[PDB]
Amino acid sequence: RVTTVGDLAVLEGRSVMIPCHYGPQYASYVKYWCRGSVKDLCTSLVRSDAPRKVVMFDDPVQQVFTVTMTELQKEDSGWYWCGVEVGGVWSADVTASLHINVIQGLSVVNSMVSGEEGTSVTVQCLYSQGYRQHEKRWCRSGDWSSCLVTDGEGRYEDQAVEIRDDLTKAFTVTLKGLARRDTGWYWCAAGQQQVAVYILVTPPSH
């Protein structure tokens, strides 16, 4: 038995850390990480016996080997396999697949953010590598003229809203003091890509 996580979606430029868990029989065998939709036609990318891009760490005591793939590119999308190198065992017992979809655009940590009127909330907008140099914007849905846009230093600030772009992976939008009219749909956006975020402002408490 070899098992791993379910299919993944990751923004271009980010890394993944994949556990390949295996049964206690397989502690002593070489572990490998394979790419291809068809196990019998796959290409080995890294092995646990390599002499001393992708990193492998087999931990027999925890009965898992961990595969790290860094700086993923869109062309890295596809099927991958955890494998144990052992002869004379059913291939299904010593391999496990998963699909990695490397995406270009934006995503959001939490697409529903709520807070009491008069308090502050933060939205964390994530973006893939191709948007590092784009101005970032926060817009109210339905209102083109409402966008608040970062400057050349990745910054926007007025009385109500601050945007801080870390210039590599994410920009945060801080709504500094919610009013109940702020409830509704918004966009994190860069270039022609966007991700929807809902803000729910709840009543002030006694």
Give the dihedral of Cα atoms 135, 140, 145, 150; nearest 10 deg.
-20
Dihedral sign computed on CA atoms, order 99, 78, 68, 33: positive
**HSE, side-chain direction, 13 A CA sphere, residue 191:** 13
Contact in structure between 47 and 31 (CB atoms under 8 Å): yes
In angstroms, rounded to a whole number, what is the distance separating the alpha carbons of residues 165 and 67? 30
Phi, psi (deg, nearest 5) at residue 97: -110, 165
Checking DSSP bridges between strand 155-157 and strand 136-140, what pairing results, if any? unpaired
Does one domain contain both 40 and 111? no
CA 138 to chain centre: 20
Contact in structure between 122 and 173 (CB atoms under 8 Å): yes
Task: Give the number of other CB atoms < 10 A from CB of residue 133.
Answer: 9
In angstroms, rounded to a whole number, what is the distance separating the alpha carbons of residues 120 and 161? 10
Domain boundaries, position 17: 1-104
In angstroms, rounded to a whole number, what is the distance separating the alpha carbons of residues 153 and 171? 12
Technique used? X-ray
In angstroms, rounded to a whole number, what is the distance separating the alpha carbons of residues 152 and 170? 15
* CATH number, domain with residue 84: 2.60.40.10
In angstroms, rounded to a whole number, what is the distance separating the alpha carbons of residues 137 and 128? 15
Does one domain contain both 16 and 33? yes
**HSE, side-chain direction, 13 A CA sphere, residue 166:** 11
Q: Hunting for tokens 């206690």 — which residue is that? A: 24
The domain tally of the chain equals 2
Resolution (A): 1.7
